[PDB]
């Protein structure tokens, strides 16, 4: 009897096996774009993926991983209000069984159909099992989609799916290019918080750019074949797996734009 997203398991259910659930700095949180205040002193952030290596995807019950190899300093964040190196470990999405909803954050209380998680983990902690048990140990960068037009560099994810259907499949997936998966702007909010799924860590410096990414309602579709399940087991499919906006308690969401 684990956790997941159903009735009886779901977001309102976590805190009896991880009381951080209810803590002072838990992820995601409602982006109040009127109260956030510009902090002219943030740097633009530095998104260098052009040594990215991804490996593999994987089905882990919960989402889909498109990892990387982070034994070195090859696709790394930096600058914005980060201080010192994250390397990407993984990226993976969150996303709707509608495309009114699906996101984690919010926007004034609006809901995207899906929002994309690229994690990554601070190089002076040595490794992520470290890094997660540090208040500054993960930047996550996140980034909305929202359904119309398709995005040509997330249709080799999409396209792997129907290999990892169920729960533990993995699949080989090696040079993805995730500058694929990025919008125009770098403009982004950015606050301290936690994983948004157990362990519930408050570990994550939160980076959530401004503009979403579009992508095609053919896409989002096939993310909504996905099994929590696996092999073997009755259906249930992946969607919903989203946990929803948090009390924001003693924080301020700083903004990188006027
Ligand atoms: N949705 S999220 O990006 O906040 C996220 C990223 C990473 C984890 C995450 C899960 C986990 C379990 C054991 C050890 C380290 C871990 N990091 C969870 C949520
Ligand atoms: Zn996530």
């Known amino acids: ?32 774009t009127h109260t956030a205040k510009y902090d002219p002193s943030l740097k633009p952030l530095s998104v260098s993926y052009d040594q990215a290596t991804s490996l593999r995807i994987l089905n882990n019950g919960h989402a889909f991983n498109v990892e990387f190899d982070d034994s ?13 190196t994250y390397r990407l470990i993984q990226f993976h999405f969150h996303w709707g069984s509608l495309d009114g909803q699906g996101s984690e954050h919010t926007v004034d209380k609006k809901k995207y159909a899906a929002e994309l998680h690229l994690v990554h983990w601070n190089t ?20 909305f989609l929202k359904v119309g037009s398709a995005k040509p560099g997330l249709q080799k994810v999409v396209d792997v799916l129907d290999s990892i259907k169920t729960k533990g499949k993995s699949a080989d997936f090696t040079n993805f290019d995730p500058r694929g998966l990025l919008p125009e702007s770098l403009d982004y909010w950015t606050y301290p918080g936690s994983l948004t799924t157990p362990p519930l860590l408050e570990c994550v410096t939160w980076i959530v750019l401004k503009e979403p990414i579009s992508v095609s309602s053919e896409q989002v579709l096939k993310f909504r074949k996905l099994n929590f399940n696996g092999e073997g087991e009755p259906e249930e499919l992946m969607v919903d797996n989203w946990r929803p906006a948090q009390p924001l308690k003693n924080r301020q969401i700083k903004a990188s734009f006027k």
């Open 72 to 84: 070195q300093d090859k696709a790394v964040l930096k600058g914005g209000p980060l201080d010192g």
């Open 124 to 143: 002076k902690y040595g490794d992520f099992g470290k890094a997660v048990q540090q208040p500054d140990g993960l930047a996550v960068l996140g980034i």
């Open 1 to 32: 009897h684990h956790w997941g997203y159903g009735k009886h398991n779901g977001p309102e259910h976590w805190h009896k096996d991880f009381p951080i659930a209810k803590g002072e700095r838990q992820s995601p949180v409602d982006i109040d």
